[model samples]
Target: IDKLFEILAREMTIIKKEKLQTEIPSQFGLKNSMFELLNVYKLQEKMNSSLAESQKMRRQFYSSLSYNTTDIFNLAEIVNKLYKDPKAHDTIKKISGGIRIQQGFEVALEDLAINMDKLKANDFNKNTLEEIYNLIVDLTLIKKEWLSTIETLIKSSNATLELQYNTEKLNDHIEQTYKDTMISLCLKSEQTLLHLDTLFK
Candidate 1:
């Protein structure tokens, strides 16, 4: 499972770096805004690379399955291109096919496990076996990570709703001639906006 560990380590490193760069400034010494922006640019590069690698490995593993093998490979190629040229909404539609891709991978993995004795008797190289094992482990871990990411995304969306509500309240106060309160609320809103921008960055 070395490959799995390698991929997971890379992902974890990126996440940790992002969290530190975004969240640290508020608690630690002041950091220049430009420095934060630079960190964000670096993080985006890392995230893009990680996303591509994850999809590539998953495609390879899925295509190794005997069932729907050809179609899966074609889909993987298309998906890779979509990642590169995501100018159209059609790319988003194509990604929706990921459920089938995931299913194909699971079938291939189960087939390998069931036929392990046969595969071993064929004198398959140790590296191949290890690669398959790592792929399985990585797939499991990534599934959990996907769920966590979805949860976080949902929470962030909800926070935006709350922000919208507070924005209306602030506007109402501003119109009521509460100048000092309006100024304070505006400052707080700006800080929150900055925080959101940094988080997504």
Candidate 2:
């Protein structure tokens, strides 16, 4: 049903682990005949690898956003509440779903930051800022979910072919999304820098 993976797990090529045995075999020979003896194999390895890559990209995503807060819009407090939330989700499929939740955050911050410095603090729409903060708090909860997904995938040493393939598909989506986001962010930052005069006026 799905096109998971093989070879790596069959070879037992764990990235980080401890081994014990005098009869240990060398880590050479992927397609080796002896390697094929293991009845269980690499459905999860591929999924895990792809998931790891996606998380790396997301770290860049998280770091790129501007941070700077309010009364009801208390950016600091909202962000703090987000981190402070004890709620969590496990078995949360893929981080892409979580990313989708955060698009609201992306758009909200961009809209706010664009005219942020230009407007007086009092003139800013307190209600809108409050809504944005609330959204941030909601979106922030997803980080925990992503963490769960990431951990599960990383440790998933096994899965059905379908499961692996589905993971691959999800990873593909998440990877493409962040790549585009990164590109757009760079362009926006560049333009914003060049047009500070426009912004000032």
Candidate 3:
């Protein structure tokens, strides 16, 4: 519906400005369904990545702690392995697929910010708009998928006491990281996509 709105608005604006009919394609449903299914595929891709990131986090958290006994040595070891060595913590966080996806969105959004207006200035081409539309849609799917996966992991991994504590410790950093970077990234990304639709209209 939003895509159709863009098309109709574009047609009206072009007609008023240039007094020429913008090319209305023969059919919208086929291409509309194509884009919809493309989103489905993108969501699947992001789901796979989210699962892998959550699995890695769980494995890392479980590996650094002792199983049953409340050994103080285990606490000290976990601290040493997970925290004292900032390198390992940084490695896990930086190597995260979520961060990678966020980074990609950051760069892609920057590109769109710089280029989209320039394209609009010259001429609004449907092909160009479709490319931008796909990029934004892909970013949206991955962002939402990652957020859902992380939230579920945080909630579900509270099964064991040790796992809960481990997750609790890491959760602070995870939430902080998302707030600092991913949250803002998603906010700006959503705004960009929305504004793109508005501008195209």
Candidate 4:
């Protein structure tokens, strides 16, 4: 029903055609033609299964990173606001705990991204699958940059919290600007993912 299944079906048809073409030549003197055709079909089936598994893994990796990025963005926005709100010292007291949790999530995301990269880097017999995997790997790199930006923002917030000088208004302006920029980046990333999905389809 899905686009992936449709592709696999089409591939199976092509493989059958190839087998038939090859078997036609065996009509004169080939003895084990039928068994040879069966063996080819089995190999084609294995290729199909391998391609499907790789695609599934790629999807899982992207979904996990997306979820983690959403959480990071949400937490960053809250922490940025709390850092600037002059009357929210008590609220800011809780940000450290949230930051700690976010660090753990980031670590998990990085691990998944690494595994996906390994799958992408490995050789594949089919060029189409290899291309798709390469795209997934590139997307993972983009996500890593986004995560790095969030880490920088978190460190900046920590420094701002410790400053004795009354840079509240200036800090608020900067935080708002950073929030706007990050929201734009997130939108762009979402659009890229949508485009990649369409391509896969």
Candidate 5:
């Protein structure tokens, strides 16, 4: 939508003002004039039917999806929340999947803060909360910041997703990898030590 409006903002100079074609030679060919398109009888019929059944976007990607606490959350809560408001889920699942809501960050942070230490804040959960806050700050790059881009929203979206993909692979990968293997190694190591001691005895 950012790139849509960007080209729209630029093309208004051409089509509306400079007098050229309606819609930028957009890859998707989404017409710039919403009212004009919607007003047309043939297209409006299609648009109405299309708009009626809002398809739920898959969990992997869509609007603002996050799969971490940055990592520490109830998977059950995630399932419940996603199932509850599917349309809203269709619109936005969240900052990450498997992440909780209300009390997870919104409710929990403020409530925790009030009772928390001015400095430590109970093992510095505040810092964790603030990291999410900072994530929101960086989110502008993914959100409206891209709105001003010179490229088409499609291209900007490609670039945005590519950047996110790179970051997730680079940063989130190691953490999840360590988490997945960490317990297995510990269990194996404990068994190894027991076996060694038994053999010696």
Candidate 6:
């Protein structure tokens, strides 16, 4: 159905610890090899390898974000509840989706870094270079969007119970979340670009 729907399904089903070891491997064709053991040698090994890769990527995604995932989600919920504009919903999705994409870029960069020595001279050509160029462009755009979206939330506020304690506190929360995410992303991007520079040289 929807892209988000598939993500939701994976989050609920595949990401669940109970399913990771057994159900996930089965989904990758481990069950099929049971009946055709002789013909499908190393099927289990392949399944386990893929499963491990998925697990590693998931860990790296959250760690790369370098902030509390729940806290970020809560910020989305806060804007959804307090902000009245229809753009509010779009901003929520925009920020959430952008963060996911940022995580993907970070993971890709990490993969490239890990295999840096294995990469051939041909790997540094236009195709690979352009991919890095495009990635940096996307990161810049995403960062700008996030800043603009959050600034909107800061400027506009509804007089509600949450805002009662101190509107300044709410602003502080917003600022902190923005700082955390941006700083973490900048550090990762900087390190990756430095590695790319060294490799290119």
Candidate 1 Cα lDDT to native: 0.36
Could you tell me the C-alpha RMSD of candidate 6 in Å?
Answer: 16.1
Order the candidates by TM-score, highest first — what do you get?
Answer: 3, 4, 6, 1, 2, 5
Once model 6 is optimally superposed onto the true structure by TM-score, how far is the C-alpha of residue 28 displaced, in angstroms? Answer: 35
lDDT of each structure? 0.36, 0.31, 0.42, 0.39, 0.27, 0.41
lDDT at 187 for candidate 6?
Answer: 60
Angstrom error at residue 94, model 2: 5.3
lDDT of 1 at 143: 40
lDDT of 3 by residue, 1-201 (tens): 265346435533532442232212311121222111222232243211234443332222222211112322232233333443343354234223343455445445555545656655546776767766665666646556555544444444344576445644554554554434544544555565555555444
lDDT of 4 by residue, 89-160 (tens): 333332222222233333333343444444344463356555544444454444555555556555555565
User: Which scores higher on TM-score, 1 or 2?
Assistant: 1
The true-versus-predicted C-alpha distance at residue 39 of model 2, in Å, is: 34
TM-score of each: 0.32, 0.28, 0.36, 0.35, 0.21, 0.33
Task: List, residue by residue over 1-201, the lDDT tens digit for candidate 1.
Answer: 345446445544543443333222121111211112111232243211234443333333232222233333343333333333334223323233233334433444445445545435546566655655544555544444433332332243235444234434323322343334323433443343344223222
What TM-score does candidate 4 get on C-alpha atoms? 0.35
Candidate 6 lDDT over 1-201, as tens digits, reads 133234334333432442233223332222222112212122344312345553443333233223334433334345434234343333333333333444544544444445444443464465765555454445444545554544454444324566534535444544445545644554655555555456445
Off by over 4 Å in 3: 1-95, 121-124, 162-201
Q: Which TM-score value belongs to model 5?
A: 0.21
**1-201, model 5: which lDDT tens digit per residue?**
233235334423432332222221221111221111222232244211233221111111111123222111222222223333433232122222211211122222233234333323345455444543343223322322222211222232234454234533322332333323333332433343344223222
Model 6 accuracy (lDDT, Cα): 0.41
Off by over 4 Å in 6: 1-77, 80-92, 118-123, 126-134, 144-148, 158-201
Tens digits of lDDT, candidate 2, 1-201: 000013123212321121121111321121121122112223332211234543332322232221100111221122222222223011122222333334433444444446445343566666654543443334333433443433343333123454234544434433444334433433443343334323334
Give the Cα error of residue 86 in candidate 4, in Å. Answer: 12
